[PDB]
Amino acid sequence: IDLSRERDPNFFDNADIPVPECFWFMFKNNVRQDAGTCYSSWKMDKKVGPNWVHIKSDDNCNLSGDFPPGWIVLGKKRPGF
Amino acid sequence: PKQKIVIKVSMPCSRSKAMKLVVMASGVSSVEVTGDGKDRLQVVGDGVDAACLVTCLRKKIGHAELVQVEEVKE
Numbered sequence: 001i002d003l004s005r006e007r008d009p010n011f012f013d014n015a016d017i018p019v020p021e022c023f024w025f026m027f028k029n030n031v032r033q034d035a036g037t038c039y040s041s042w043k044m045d046k047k048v049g050p051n052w053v054h055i056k057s058d059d060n061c062n063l064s065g066d067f068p069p070g071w072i073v074l075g076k077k078r079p080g081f
Numbered sequence: 082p083k084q085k086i087v088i089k090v091s092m093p094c095s096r097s098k099a100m101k102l103v104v105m106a107s108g109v110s111s112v113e114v115t116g117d118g119k120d121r122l123q124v125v126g127d128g129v130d131a132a133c134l135v136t137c138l139r140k141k142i143g144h145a146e147l148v149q150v151e152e153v154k155e
Contacts, residue, residue: 012113014125017083017153034117036087036149044151 001030003076009035021081022061026073038063040077048073086131087115087149088122090138099142103134121148 006025013019021040026033026048038044041059045052048071055065061075090099096114099122103112108128115123124134131147138145 010115010117010119012115012123014111014113014123016110017085017125018155020154032117034121036115036121038151039154042151042154044149046150047146047148 001027001074003074006032006035009037011037013037019081021078022057022063022075023078024055024061024063024073024075026071028071037078038075040081046073083110083125083127083153083155084129085149085151085153086124086129086134086147088124088131088135088138088145089116089120089148090122090145091143092120095142099138102137102141106130106134106137125153 009023020037022038024038025035040057040061042057044055046055049068051068053065055063057063061077063073063075092099100112103124109126111125113123115121135145135147
């Protein structure tokens, strides 16, 4: 997994709220399943395969949480943020 | 108190209809299609009832499930 080789998520930054600073990419057994946006220095709840995961983001979009086996969600700061 | 919720919805035409159903719900400010499969509705609003949305989408469109909940960082 090199996130520099991952195409951008299919994002929509709503103009009515702050732009999220992170891209997230979800993998099962190292194959991309989906991708999206989330805020840095923040938190979200995300369905990761069969489980709900509470995912914390740091200031560089490093993501942490209790992922089920086989699954990961990796973050990266969007260009210019 | 703004929220971003993402709901995955089986939308193979119907996407129109799903989006119409969501953008009309109480509290909803916006809905747009996201995701690698173009099948995640990204719903932004105040006081949005996810359960209600998922339920209606099941009734009217086809399988729906809540996949992301993020408070809007201000």
